[PDB]
Amino acid sequence: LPSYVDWRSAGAVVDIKSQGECGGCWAFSAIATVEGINKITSGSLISLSEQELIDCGRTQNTRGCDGGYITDGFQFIINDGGINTEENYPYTAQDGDCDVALQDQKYVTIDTYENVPYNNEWALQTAVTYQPVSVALDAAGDAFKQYASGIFTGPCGTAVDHAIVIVGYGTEGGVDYWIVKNSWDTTWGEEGYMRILRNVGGAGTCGIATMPSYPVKY
Numbered sequence: 001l002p003s004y005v006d007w008r009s010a011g012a013v014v015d016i017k018s019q020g021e022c023g024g025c026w027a028f029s030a031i032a033t034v035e036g037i038n039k040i041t042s043g044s045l046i047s048l049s050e051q052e053l054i055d056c057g058r059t060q061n062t063r064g065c066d067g068g069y070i071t072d073g074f075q076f077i078i079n080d081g082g083i084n085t086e087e088n089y090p091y092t093a094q095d096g097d098c099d100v101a102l103q104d105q106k107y108v109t110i111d112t113y114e115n116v117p118y119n120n121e122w123a124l125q126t127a128v129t130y131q132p133v134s135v136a137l138d139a140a141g142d143a144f145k146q147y148a149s150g151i152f153t154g155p156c157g158t159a160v161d162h163a164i165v166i167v168g169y170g171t172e173g174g175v176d177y178w179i180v181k182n183s184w185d186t187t188w189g190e191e192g193y194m195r196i197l198r199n200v201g202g203a204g205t206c207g208i209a210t211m212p213s214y215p216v217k218y
């Protein structure tokens with residue numbers, strides 16, 4: 001595998017978004033990876049609707065702004081036969097009525113999704129080499145909330161509660177890192193992104209390797 005991977009350099013990452021107070025990061029993350037795979041496969045980068053997942057994708061324990069799971073985001077897209085764009089069904093940071101006319105308007109599709117073997121940074125690295133990957137990490141501590149720059153090393157636990165997207169990896173000064181796209185606007189981290197310590201074992205830094213998944217588009 002390569003020593004550096006950055007999906008931004010390949011035109012496969014939409015500009016940073018901001019989720020506000022709604023706890024819909026599960027949607028932010030699933031959408032970011034679907035945007036990525038769509039670019040890779042079709043050659044065109046389109047910003048997709050997190051709002052549609054929040055409003056129309058409620059299922060089991062995935063309940064809009066109340067929280068949910070990345071995989072239920074992928075499953076919504078699969079079961080619906082597609083997803084609409086950010087421009088057509090814009091984000092409001094609220095739990096709303098699913099707009100069915102907009103739900104029926106489908107521009108991008110995926111075929112299935114896969115889970116990366118949990119707690120295995122090598123398997124995660126391999127997956128990131130081919131496409132952006134969705135992950136969840138423990139973002140509850142102030143160190144995470146306060147992050148402004150550098151390769152973050154913690155402190156943080158491994159009981160995940162915030163979904164984000166890995167868009168690459170690299171090494172600098174002998175220190176391996178993952179490049180993470182967050183949905184907290186460009187005013188958090190390095191213009192909206194974070195570099196976080198890689199190859200630490202087990203669940204990874206802040207549990208970043210404990211529950212990865214990615215969409216598949218043949």
Ligand SMILES: [N+]
Pocket residue numbers: 052080082083084102103104105106107
């Ligand atoms: N849709």
